[PDB]
Amino acid sequence: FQSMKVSVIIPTYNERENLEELFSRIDNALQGLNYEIVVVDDDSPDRTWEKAQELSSKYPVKVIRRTKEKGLSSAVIRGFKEASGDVFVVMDADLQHPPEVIPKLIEAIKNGSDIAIGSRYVKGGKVENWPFYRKLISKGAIMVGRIALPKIRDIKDPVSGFFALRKEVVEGVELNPIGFKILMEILIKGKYSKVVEVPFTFGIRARGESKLKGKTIFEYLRHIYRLMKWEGEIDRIVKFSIVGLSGILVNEGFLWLFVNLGIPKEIAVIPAVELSILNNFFWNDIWTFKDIRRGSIFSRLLKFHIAALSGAVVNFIVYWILLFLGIHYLIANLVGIVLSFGVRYVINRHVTWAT
Ligand SMILES: Nc1nc2c(ncn2[C@@H]2O[C@H](COP(=O)(O)OP(=O)(O)O)[C@@H](O)[C@H]2O)c(=O)[nH]1
Ligand SMILES: CCCCCCCCCCCC[N+](C)(C)[O-]
Ligand SMILES: CCCCCCCCCCCC[N+](C)(C)[O-]
Ligand SMILES: CCCCCCCCCCCC[N+](C)(C)[O-]
Ligand SMILES: CCCCCCCCCCCC[N+](C)(C)[O-]
Ligand SMILES: CCCCCCCCCCCC[N+](C)(C)[O-]
Ligand SMILES: CCCCCCCCCCCC[N+](C)(C)[O-]
Ligand SMILES: CCCCCCCCCCCC[N+](C)(C)[O-]
Ligand SMILES: [Cl-]
Ligand SMILES: [Mg+2]
């Protein structure tokens, strides 16, 4: 069936010795199929391009050398432009991504998926000779993305450099050239209705230096922020804060009104805070999250109370921990309120108004 064309897009910087092994294993994996290899090199101080062309004698290789541009994601964007296939396959050149699982990726695509992700973290997925710490940092960084970007909440390895997609997913789509995690750009901005993750083993690099470890983490966080903006999450967070501010005023307002009407201070606090919660739910339901209301309004009201209570607990615990660590009580209090707001937003975004 793969009379349809497959383009294997490979970004390279100083990837030399690996090419011979790479192309060999790729060809054997994709034996007899209509495929091309598209190498995108940013004028390596390295011979290859050169080695690439030479294997063009034996392998269907298209070589793109760019002198004006640098960057991993930028190269992949270039690959999409230069590729002529119906299905794109993106992978590294160092054999950490095994060419032998490419058939499973394209098979998923033929079976009806728009994107097939080579994933280290779904059932079956593994990583080879990783220290436990590095594995934590990885899944920890991934967790941040899944929570901050609800669209990829259920993706286990959204930062993978190894994936396949129908050309339709990214044609007509403007992808941001900055960064490394091109898949995350695609998951957010691409056109698709079905993604699957396919387990594989992230193997040992065989030969050559590493060019990205570690130069990725704070870029990754700025990438997340750009995507939060794009998704309207930043907008929701600002509106949520504004509502939250109004709630503080409403709380103090009723507290004053109640005690001056002959109601004891430590009795008046209860209706005052509950009214502030009701106030906060109301504006968030008709403004902040108006477009993603589901089910009964009472069910949302109850979930909102859970988030509000969770916020108060986080605020309490954070404050005292910081006080025990020797932090000034005003800073401690500030951080408590900020983390409370953060937790309340996350719980309301993922539970009260879940998507
Ligand atoms: N074209 C291009 N390729 C890059 C760039 N940075 C990294 N790569 C390629 O991306 C692939 C994976 O990079 P690698 O160093 O193995 O990342 P690591 O697995 O985290 O160590 C390799 O084939 C590199 O050649 C870049 O700036 N431009
Ligand atoms: C879960 C939140 C992700 C952390 C965001 C890290 C990037 C912050 C730097 C981007 C600059 C933001 N700003 C407001 C100055 O434009
Ligand atoms: C807390 C200071 C920040 C200023 C924001 C004050 C609330 C702005 C509400 C604008 C919404 C009005 N409108 C018509 C768009 O619904
Ligand atoms: C469809 C209308 C959307 C609601 C308009 C904006 C509601 C903001 C109400 C809270 C702001 C109160 N305060 C004190 C900050 O001005
Ligand atoms: C059964 C005891 C309940 C203790 C929990 C107290 C909840 C405090 C909620 C504070 C939120 C008020 N405000 C103005 C920030 O919305
Ligand atoms: C919705 C509750 C608000 C009702 C009226 C609130 C009156 C505002 C407080 C007036 C001044 C209070 N204080 C302590 C500064 O004197
Ligand atoms: C931010 C937490 C500090 C709030 C101070 C007042 C707390 C008094 C108990 C509030 C109980 C809230 N509610 C609605 C569950 O009753
Ligand atoms: C991991 C949860 C941390 C619990 C924080 C414990 C707070 C202890 C505060 C003690 C000071 C208050 N007081 C009035 C009893 O002195
Ligand atoms: Cl709230
Ligand atoms: Mg590598």
Numbering used by the authors: -2 to 352
Sentences from the paper on this structure:
The overall structure of PfDPMS features an N-terminal, cytoplasmic catalytic domain covalently attached to a TM domain with four TM helices (TMHs) arranged as two TMH dimers, TMD1 and TMD2. Besides the TM domain, two IF helices (IFH1 and IFH2) are appended to the cytoplasmic GT-A domain in PfDPMS.
The guanosine moiety of GDP is located in a pocket formed at the C-terminal ends of the parallel β-strands β1–β4, where interactions are offered mainly with the β-α loop regions. In addition, the guanine ring stacks with the hydrophobic Leu69 side chain (β3-α3 loop). Asp91 and Gln93 in the 89DADLQH94 motif coordinate the α- and β-phosphate groups of GDP via the metal cation: α-phosphate O2A – Me2+ – Asp91 OD2, and α-phosphate O2B – Me2+ – Gln93 OE1. The active site in the catalytic domain is gated by a flexible loop (residues 202–210), which we refer to as the acceptor loop, or A-loop. In the PfDPMS•GDP•Mg2+ and PfDPMS•GDP-Man•Mn2+ complexes, the A-loop is closed and folded over the diphosphate-binding site to create an outer wall (“front door”) of the active site. On the other side of the donor pocket, Phe177 assumes a conformation that together with complementary shielding from the A-loop prevents the donor from leaving through a “back door”. The PfDPMS•GDP•Mg2+ and PfDPMS•GDP-Man•Mn2+ complexes are very similar with only minor shifts in side chains located in IFH1 and IFH2, which do not interact directly with GDP or GDP-Man.
